[PDB]
């Protein structure tokens, strides 16, 4: 099983009534954990276990750091709006990230995204941005002008994203790691389908043109899926059911 | 957290001038160095922020994350290099924690 | 990479009024903090400057003596009320944090030497 913590940033420019004009969230593995937007101007917990863990001043610290986040947010959708010389409400997007491996090798992302398309891209295993257009490539340009700013975030994805990640797993172990076997059943619909539910990590592989149903959630915190024309794995277990 | 620095240093002409600095915060993830004459602010002039080595002209930034000490060396230094060392440290939260200085008497 | 530019460079001051002293940055940064530091001696950290909202204050230095107003990330004023000659120092403006050129380290500018006389 792999393991990642990853945060979100969404930068909606001239929003519409309703709509934040910022908003950021993290995520541990499928779990919301942290939130933040331009409403409330605080990061505030997403998980009781998040809550019982952190001091107060970690969620007074961040939150002076996502003020200023939002802030540059702001400013950057602006730099993109007067290059590509665009009027109106338009997005900006970022994901930063790391996952841990079952064998103990890690995996370090981070990406920037300009209405829904891919901006920027970062590879921290050779200090330098995959640009998407000229746009991008200006950018580009004035971030790797600044060892620091290549340094600081490859060393965020390789060490302090990682030493992050375990905190919040030993905070959530009773939820995170648990292990919820599916309860698999077979129907015979008609106008061959081997239904699973109430399982959990989402992860499952089912098998007998085959046709297979997406993993949704429950609403319980277990998923759900179907596989229609029986084998199933979760967790390292296989299940057998027959006609 | 804190640092911690020394304070009165006097090094020879030409040899080098190795200036140690430690910290308390076992999660703290960079380590700047910053030189400030009498007069003047600090200025950086390096930083730090994997384990080993990190040479830029005469300097040498050293970095032991186990033992948690950070080392600046100047060789070949100078009596231009005569000033005020400072060691900061930056936590998780992106803090900056200044130490004592310790002020460098490079004798001609 | 960014330059600091703090106003005025010297004042000489008398006891019992106030002066407030500014800081303007060429480009946005998100982190501003405020320090004092005599001549010979070390730099003490008086506060991070919040924009839009007060200011938070280390150990010591307090609202009513030192306020801080910060309305955007390039500009911030120091102000201190009712001068002593304790207060004379050299208040330094310090910027560090993201930009649009990335992570900056902090950087300093060249202060505000302030002599309060009797």
């Known amino acids: 099983r792999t393991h990642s913590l990853r945060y979100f940033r969404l930068g909606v420019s001239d929003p519409i009534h309703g709509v934040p004009e910022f908003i950021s969230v993290g995520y541990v593995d499928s779990h919301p954990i942290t939130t933040y937007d331009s409403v409330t101007r605080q990061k505030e917990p997403r998980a009781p276990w998040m809550a019982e863990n952190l001091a107060p001043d970690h969620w007074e610290r961040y939150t002076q750091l996502l003020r200023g986040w939002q802030q540059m947010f702001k400013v950057e959708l602006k730099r993109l709006q007067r290059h590509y010389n665009h009027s109106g409400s338009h997005t900006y997007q970022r994901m930063i990230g790391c996952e841990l491996l079952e064998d103990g090798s890690t995996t370090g992302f981070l990406q920037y995204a300009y209405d829904g398309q891919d901006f920027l891209i970062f590879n921290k295993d050779t200090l330098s941005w995959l640009a998407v257009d000229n746009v991008a490539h200006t950018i580009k340009q004035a971030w790797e002008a600044n060892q620091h700013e290549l340094l600081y975030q490859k060393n965020w994805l390789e060490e302090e994203c990682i030493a992050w990640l375990k905190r919040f797993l030993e905070y959530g172990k009773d939820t995170l790691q648990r292990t919820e076997p599916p309860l698999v059943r077979v129907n015979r619909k008609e106008t061959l389908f081997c239904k699973a539910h109430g399982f959990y990590p989402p992860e499952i592989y089912m098998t007998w043109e085959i046709d297979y149903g997406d993993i949704l959630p429950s609403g319980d915190g277990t998923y759900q899926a179907w596989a229609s024309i029986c084998h199933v794995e979760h967790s390292g277990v296989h299940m057998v059911l027959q006609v | 957290e804190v640092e911690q620095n020394s304070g009165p240093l006097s090094v020879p002409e030409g040899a080098i001038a190795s200036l140690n600095c430690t910290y308390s915060?076992?999660?703290?993830?960079?380590f700047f160095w910053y030189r400030q004459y009498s007069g003047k602010s600090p200025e950086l002039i390096m930083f730090?922020?994997?384990?080993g080595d990190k040479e830029d002209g005469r300097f040498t930034a050293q970095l032991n994350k186990a033992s948690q000490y950070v080392s600046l060396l100047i060789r070949d230094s100078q009596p231009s290099d005569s000033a005020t060392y400072l060691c900061?440290?930056?936590?998780?939260?992106?803090?900056?924690?200044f130490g004592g200085g310790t002020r460098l008497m490079v004798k001609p | 990479s960014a330059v600091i530019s703090q106003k005025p460079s010297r004042d000489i001051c008398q006891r019992g009024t106030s002066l407030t002293i500014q800081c303007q940055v060429d480009?946005?940064?998100?982190?501003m903090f405020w320090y004092r530091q005599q001549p010979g001696q070390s730099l003490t950290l008086i506060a991070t400057?919040?924009?839009?909202?007060?200011?938070?204050?280390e150990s010591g230095f307090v609202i009513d003596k030192f306020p801080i107003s910060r309305p955007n990330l390039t500009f911030s004023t120091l102000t201190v009320s009712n001068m002593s000659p304790e207060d004379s120092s050299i208040y330094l403006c310090?910027?560090?944090?993201?930009?649009?050129?990335?992570?900056?380290?902090?950087?300093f500018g060249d202060g505000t030497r302030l002599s309060i006389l009797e």
């Open positions: 730090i922020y994997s384990n």
């Open positions: 915060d076992r999660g703290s993830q960079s």
């Open positions: 400057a919040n924009q839009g909202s007060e200011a938070t204050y």
């Open positions: 310090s910027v560090g944090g993201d930009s649009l050129i990335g992570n900056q380290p902090q950087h």
């Open positions: 900061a440290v930056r936590d998780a939260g992106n803090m900056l924690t």
């Open positions: 480009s946005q940064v998100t982190m």
